[PDB]
Design a protein around this nucleic acid. Structure first.
Ligand SMILES: [Mg+2]
Ligand SMILES: [Mg+2]
Ligand SMILES: [Mg+2]
Ligand SMILES: [Mg+2]
Ligand SMILES: [Mg+2]
Ligand SMILES: [Mg+2]
Ligand SMILES: [Mg+2]
Ligand SMILES: [Mg+2]
Ligand SMILES: [Mg+2]
Ligand SMILES: [Mg+2]
Ligand SMILES: [Mg+2]
Ligand SMILES: [Mg+2]
Ligand SMILES: [Mg+2]
Ligand SMILES: [Mg+2]
Ligand SMILES: [Mg+2]
Ligand SMILES: [Mg+2]
Ligand SMILES: [Mg+2]
Ligand SMILES: [Mg+2]
Ligand SMILES: [Mg+2]
Ligand SMILES: [Mg+2]
Ligand SMILES: [Mg+2]
Ligand SMILES: [Mg+2]
Ligand SMILES: [Mg+2]
Ligand SMILES: [Mg+2]
Ligand SMILES: [Mg+2]
Ligand SMILES: [Mg+2]
Ligand SMILES: [Mg+2]
Ligand SMILES: [Mg+2]
Ligand SMILES: [Mg+2]
Ligand SMILES: [Mg+2]
Ligand SMILES: [Mg+2]
Ligand SMILES: [Mg+2]
Ligand SMILES: [Mg+2]
Ligand SMILES: [Mg+2]
Ligand SMILES: [Mg+2]
Ligand SMILES: [Mg+2]
Ligand SMILES: [Mg+2]
Ligand SMILES: [Mg+2]
Ligand SMILES: [Mg+2]
Ligand SMILES: [Mg+2]
Ligand SMILES: [Mg+2]
Ligand SMILES: [Mg+2]
Ligand SMILES: [Mg+2]
Ligand SMILES: [Mg+2]
Ligand SMILES: [Mg+2]
Ligand SMILES: [Mg+2]
Ligand SMILES: [Mg+2]
Ligand SMILES: [Mg+2]
Ligand SMILES: [Mg+2]
Ligand SMILES: [Mg+2]
Ligand SMILES: [Mg+2]
Ligand SMILES: [Mg+2]
Ligand SMILES: [Mg+2]
Ligand SMILES: [Mg+2]
Ligand SMILES: [Mg+2]
Ligand SMILES: [Mg+2]
Ligand SMILES: [Mg+2]
Ligand SMILES: [Mg+2]
Ligand SMILES: [Mg+2]
Ligand SMILES: [Mg+2]
Ligand SMILES: [Mg+2]
Ligand SMILES: [Mg+2]
Ligand SMILES: [Mg+2]
Ligand SMILES: [Mg+2]
Ligand SMILES: [Mg+2]
Ligand SMILES: [Mg+2]
Ligand SMILES: [Mg+2]
Ligand SMILES: [Mg+2]
Ligand SMILES: [Mg+2]
Ligand SMILES: [Mg+2]
Ligand SMILES: [Mg+2]
Ligand SMILES: [Mg+2]
Ligand SMILES: [Mg+2]
Ligand SMILES: [Mg+2]
Ligand SMILES: [Mg+2]
Ligand SMILES: [Mg+2]
Ligand SMILES: [Mg+2]
Ligand SMILES: [Mg+2]
Ligand SMILES: [Mg+2]
Ligand SMILES: [Mg+2]
Ligand SMILES: [Mg+2]
Ligand SMILES: [Mg+2]
Ligand SMILES: [Mg+2]
Ligand SMILES: [Mg+2]
Ligand SMILES: [Mg+2]
Lengths: 50, 148, 57, 185
RNA sequence: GCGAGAGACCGAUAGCGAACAAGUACAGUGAUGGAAAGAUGAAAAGAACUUUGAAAAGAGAGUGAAAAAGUACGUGAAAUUGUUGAAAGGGAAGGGCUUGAGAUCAGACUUGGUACCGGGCCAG
RNA sequence: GCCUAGACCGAGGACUGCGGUUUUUACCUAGGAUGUUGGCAUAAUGAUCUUAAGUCGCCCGUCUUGAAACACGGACCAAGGAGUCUAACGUCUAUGCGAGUGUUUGGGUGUAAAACCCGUACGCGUAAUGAAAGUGAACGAAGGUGGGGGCCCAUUAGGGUGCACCAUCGACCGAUCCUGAUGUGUUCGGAUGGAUUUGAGUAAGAGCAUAGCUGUUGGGACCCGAAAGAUGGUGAACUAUGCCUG
RNA sequence: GGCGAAAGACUAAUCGAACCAUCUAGUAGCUGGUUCCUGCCGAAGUUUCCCUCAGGAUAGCAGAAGCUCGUAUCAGUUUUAU
RNA sequence: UUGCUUAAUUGAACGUGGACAAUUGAAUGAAGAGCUUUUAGUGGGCCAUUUUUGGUAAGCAGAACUGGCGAUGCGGGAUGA
RNA sequence: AGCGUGCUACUUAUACUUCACCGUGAUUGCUGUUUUGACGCUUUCACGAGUAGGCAGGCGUGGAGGUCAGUGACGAAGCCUUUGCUGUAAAGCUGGGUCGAACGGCCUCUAGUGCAGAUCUUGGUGGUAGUAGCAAAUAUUCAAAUGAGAACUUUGAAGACUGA
RNA sequence: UAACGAGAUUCCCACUGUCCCUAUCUACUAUCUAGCGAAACCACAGCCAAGGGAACGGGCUUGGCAGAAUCAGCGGGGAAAG
RNA sequence: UACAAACCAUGAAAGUGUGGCCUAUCGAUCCUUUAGUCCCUCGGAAUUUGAGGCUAGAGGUGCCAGAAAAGUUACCACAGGG
RNA sequence: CUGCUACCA
RNA sequence: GGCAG
């Protein structure tokens, strides 16, 4: 269980971690939709600054 | 890539490099840091001495912002002077007009005294300085101005 | 039930002679670790004065 | 049968080529393979071997090392040769006028060298102004200053650095590092 | 849940258990458990008619590009099996090496040059 | 010294060499086979397949000191079938930049999950040491000595200069112990000089990032395998016992 | 839990603790298996510690990558002296 | 040179300078020496000669040195780790 | 053709000697003739056992970027086959037959990538083997009808049984 | 301890194929045919003796030997199967 | 075991003495407790209690590199082991 | 010295 | 290791 001259690790994976894995596949989609929300909000109230 | 792994080369050989006697098993020796005082003592004593035990006093609710104090040495102190005006300052600097080096505004808490300064007066503004850093700054005709 | 071989030095000289047996390297200056502290203390001053005299010469 | 006094079919254990696939490094190896094969100058054989070396075996050479090598007696006008990267040193108070041939220059190092009236040339320009390496001086960087070497040969009473992820009072300082906690090694 | 667009994903023992009248058939008193199963052909053009037969079917014929595609449907491997042909075989058979015999395959008269020049192979 | 019988082989592919004979800038047996004759090209020759003969040949896989074993799995065939991915890491290598490095949390932009662009912070590194309060790295050409590739002067040798690195003696920083100057909120300060003590330190930075193999730890963790434990439910159509009614 | 004129009997072919689903791919120092070719190198069953004795860690043996050099000064051997 | 040591101008250690050159001071050999990192399998062994302990002995149990088998085919011992 | 001893010849191992070829390690040289391969060509010498294990170089499979303006209904893929060729090999290519719609070479990327075994999984198929067997409950028989076909159906005649 | 007992035990009378020691008879099988038609098991298979060998071989070594295809039985072996 | 720096004992002195003439006579982390420094910390700033640190002992693990631990199974189960 | 009560190295 | 006779 302990072998060689290696750093001693703290890998906190003893719970059911695989049920709580959030992978951000939607990073680009959220960026684009965030931009669209930002444009719509600006155009609604123009020329008043957002 | 999997095509570069030795799993591809072990195909056709019975034991996949794990041995016929040893027989790759689930967890011989325990899991994690098990047996660190019993059967992995020879490993922890050799490679991680000091692992077991307590040293020093605890500090409940330690806020690391209190201890922020980045160091800058004297051999690196003139890098905070504007690059476009460094040579002019190194030539025309005198007691009547010496460059001001604001170390806190550049992100440093203490001025330490490693290295040698140009023999040129400077005004160094610091939160903290070491004794030798200030002695070396005064020796070139400069001064340390404490700020907060 | 579990009576096995107790001890044997068989094959131990073969393993020692695969890569050994290597003699330690010799150097011109041995370490003065373990040498008498009073001698080492004075030898420091003697070397310092010798270096000063040769530098001045 | 033969009674073998040595291990059979043993490779030399030295690089005979760069591991790199950079075509321009291969052209440099071509030039110095020809020079080492044909000039009898030991410099060209050393340069050819050094072009094979890996990255950790070609540590960066600070412009301060070059300044110190040029401060050797009778070496002020020698051509400094670095098979590797020449880095800048903002701790210098001054740099001399010098000719330096290197694989790579950082922006600060090259700027300082040219600012002080010197030249920053490549090893192919070197092979034309000094095809036998005349009046040269090879400068190598520190190999044992690497961080990985701190942990090599760790053991009791060896004084090396433990392989550890965090640093502090709670991380490998009590038992075996202190007589108040048992023993110290 | 509703509506969309995709993928270096899987390709009918895979992918959901389910590509099909699949949470179906079926089991269990019950809670529950839970399959197998896609493919003629472009088009049924799914073989009229004659003949043997109690019939199923067969034989002719016919459709089709193909029936070496007939729904017991694309291709149609292996295990296993029938027939024909070849060979061997005294309490197993099978294998390697070597040669004989038989069978198969190959190659220099070359991309030969002009009666001759010269070449290929096997030998003295 | 001389004569004489047989077997196997013929690698190489202009010349270059060493010798020999020299009648000779020629020839040879001397840095590896040529000459000549016959036959054949519908074939002598070669390969494979089947089979006979001679000779040898135990059933593979596995655990094991030891298997053909009277040890275990295997009737046969097809299809499926077992070191993976991830978080954090060690070594090595390649690459970019380098006292810095890392665009991609986000913002801009777009031919729209792409490509392209932007910067503050932050992470790691550039300083260590002490439990901590704290303190914090040049006597000197960043030291001396012995080596040290390479370079310079030479001309066997010899001299000069000697990076990396090795051995060694020192210097500097923090901790520990000792000494204790001018002074003072008279108990603080801590100059100065030391000590067979100690640190994962300084001593002209080397790191950061991406990727790859290998190795590590946690994860289903190479694949299949318990006897058990727990949570929530379904059964007295069998059967055990009581009751009611026949 | 039931039920037992008591056998640990019976409780739907299930009883020294039923059946169903889930936790659950439970854990296994133990058994079994672990899929292409050629080339080069090539072991160990020993040391120390371990509720250690069918297991680990540690050292040894082995491979790989090399690096600094280039006859420098090495050796499972002899001789001579001690 | 020293703060060590000596009654000392004595020593101890480390040095500056000078002399002794390839028979630089025995043999034989040297597919070179030195150095580093990292990681696998293994941690049931067994046999022969010789030394050897317990046992009447054992194809028994336990040690020493070497060589082997394991991990290895080939020729011989008919057969056989 | 036994035992003790001496001698001569002779027999033959993957051992030794010479030579050929393969590979590994080292080694000689190669740029004014380097000359579209220098990760190449070339000179020389030595060496080759191997479980567990390590490393290297290759063979093969599904999919991806690029390329061959690649093959293909004038027949792709698959399958069968003493048609053969190439490679030490993993394998590649090819003749003939069958077949009917896609597929490959090369430079790279990637992985759910290679089976003889796991009392492996699912499906399929043998030998056993025309074998074990089809034997409790007393029992059937003649004729006619029907039908292509009657031990077994129907009807008649008989013989029996269950035996309230 | 009267009575009771598919309880354990000894002796006696009667009785007998339990035995000396076997024989004969009946039906149904087995057997042969028509029809129908499984399964266990199976590394490959199937003659011995000795040897050596994991110390009890079908295979190996050395001998004996050895001639198609088979039927009913049988229980030595297959260290037979489960 | 031999020194270094102290402070001592003894002897006229040189010397000798860091327990027993030598080879055995013993004990980690965590926790507690005592001695020492009266030093560091209790983190908004202080005082005094209290607590926590630093250095050295002691309380103990004899399975002595150091778990906290009674049986039975003839009702039994599983993984294996020749 | 008996009884009761208590038990983190 | 605390009480108590
Ligand atoms: Mg391995
Ligand atoms: Mg195995
Ligand atoms: Mg193991
Ligand atoms: Mg223990
Ligand atoms: Mg053992
Ligand atoms: Mg050989
Ligand atoms: Mg921890
Ligand atoms: Mg303690
Ligand atoms: Mg399906
Ligand atoms: Mg399904
Ligand atoms: Mg179909
Ligand atoms: Mg067709
Ligand atoms: Mg068809
Ligand atoms: Mg068909
Ligand atoms: Mg077939
Ligand atoms: Mg017969
Ligand atoms: Mg033949
Ligand atoms: Mg023939
Ligand atoms: Mg030839
Ligand atoms: Mg034989
Ligand atoms: Mg086994
Ligand atoms: Mg076993
Ligand atoms: Mg055994
Ligand atoms: Mg075997
Ligand atoms: Mg046997
Ligand atoms: Mg058995
Ligand atoms: Mg077994
Ligand atoms: Mg079996
Ligand atoms: Mg398959
Ligand atoms: Mg930064
Ligand atoms: Mg600090
Ligand atoms: Mg440094
Ligand atoms: Mg439990
Ligand atoms: Mg009821
Ligand atoms: Mg009872
Ligand atoms: Mg009972
Ligand atoms: Mg029941
Ligand atoms: Mg019960
Ligand atoms: Mg599993
Ligand atoms: Mg399970
Ligand atoms: Mg075990
Ligand atoms: Mg070898
Ligand atoms: Mg075992
Ligand atoms: Mg290991
Ligand atoms: Mg080990
Ligand atoms: Mg073992
Ligand atoms: Mg073994
Ligand atoms: Mg052998
Ligand atoms: Mg033999
Ligand atoms: Mg014999
Ligand atoms: Mg005789
Ligand atoms: Mg021969
Ligand atoms: Mg080999
Ligand atoms: Mg192997
Ligand atoms: Mg796939
Ligand atoms: Mg086309
Ligand atoms: Mg085709
Ligand atoms: Mg079609
Ligand atoms: Mg393509
Ligand atoms: Mg797979
Ligand atoms: Mg299979
Ligand atoms: Mg296998
Ligand atoms: Mg099976
Ligand atoms: Mg099956
Ligand atoms: Mg029958
Ligand atoms: Mg019957
Ligand atoms: Mg009656
Ligand atoms: Mg009764
Ligand atoms: Mg058998
Ligand atoms: Mg027999
Ligand atoms: Mg026997
Ligand atoms: Mg048998
Ligand atoms: Mg025989
Ligand atoms: Mg019978
Ligand atoms: Mg029998
Ligand atoms: Mg005295
Ligand atoms: Mg004393
Ligand atoms: Mg305490
Ligand atoms: Mg507070
Ligand atoms: Mg203690
Ligand atoms: Mg113990
Ligand atoms: Mg112990
Ligand atoms: Mg119990
Ligand atoms: Mg008992
Ligand atoms: Mg046994």
């Amino acid at each position: 269980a302990i072998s060689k001259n290696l750093p001693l690790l703290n890998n906190h994976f003893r719970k059911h971690w695989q049920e709580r894995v959030r992978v951000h596949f939607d990073q680009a989609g959220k960026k684009a939709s965030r931009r669209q929300s930002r444009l719509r909000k600006a155009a609604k109230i123009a020329p008043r600054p957002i | 890539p999997t095509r570069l792994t030795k799993t591809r080369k072990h195909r056709g050989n019975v034991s996949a490099g794990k041995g016929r006697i040893g027989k790759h098993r689930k967890h011989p020796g325990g899991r994690g840091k098990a047996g660190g005082q019993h059967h992995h003592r020879t490993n922890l004593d050799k490679y991680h001495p000091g692992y077991f035990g307590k040293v020093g006093m605890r500090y409940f609710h330690k806020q690391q912002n209190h201890f922020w104090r980045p160091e800058i040495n004297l051999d690196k102190l003139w890098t905070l002077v504007d690059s476009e005006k460094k040579d002019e300052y190194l030539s025309k600097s005198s007691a009547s007009a010496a460059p001001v080096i604001d170390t806190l505004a550049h992100g440093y808490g203490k001025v330490l005294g490693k290295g040698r300064l140009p023999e040129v007066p400077v005004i160094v503004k610091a939160r903290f300085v070491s004794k030798l850093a200030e002695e070396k700054i005064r020796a070139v005709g400069g001064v340390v101005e404490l700020v907060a | 039930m579990a009576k096995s071989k107790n001890h044997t030095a068989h094959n131990q000289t073969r393993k020692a002679h695969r890569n050994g047996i290597k003699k330690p390297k010799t150097y011109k200056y041995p370490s003065l670790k373990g040498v008498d502290a009073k001698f080492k203390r004075n030898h420091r001053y003697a070397l310092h004065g010798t270096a000063k005299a040769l530098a001045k010469a | 049968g033969r009674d073998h006094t040595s291990k059979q079919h043993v490779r030399s254990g030295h690089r005979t080529a760069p591991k790199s696939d950079n075509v321009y490094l291969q052209l440099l190896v071509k030039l110095y393979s020809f020079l080492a094969r044909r000039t009898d100058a030991p410099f060209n054989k050393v340069i050819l071997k050094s072009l094979f070396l890996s990255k950790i075996n070609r540590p960066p050479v600070s412009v301060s090392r070059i300044s110190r090598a040029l401060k050797q007696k009778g070496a002020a006008e020698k051509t400094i040769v670095v098979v590797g990267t020449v880095t800048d040193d903002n701790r210098l108070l001054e740099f001399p006028k010098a000719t330096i041939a290197a694989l790579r220059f950082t922006a600060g190092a090259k700027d300082r060298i040219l600012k002080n009236g010197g030249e920053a040339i490549t090893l192919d320009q070197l092979a034309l102004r000094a095809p036998k390496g005349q009046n040269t001086l090879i400068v190598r960087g520190p190999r044992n200053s690497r961080e990985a070497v701190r942990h090599f040969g760790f053991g009791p009473h060896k004084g090396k650095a433990p392989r550890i992820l965090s640093k502090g009072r709670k991380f490998e300082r009590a038992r075996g590092r202190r007589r108040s906690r048992g023993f110290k090694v």
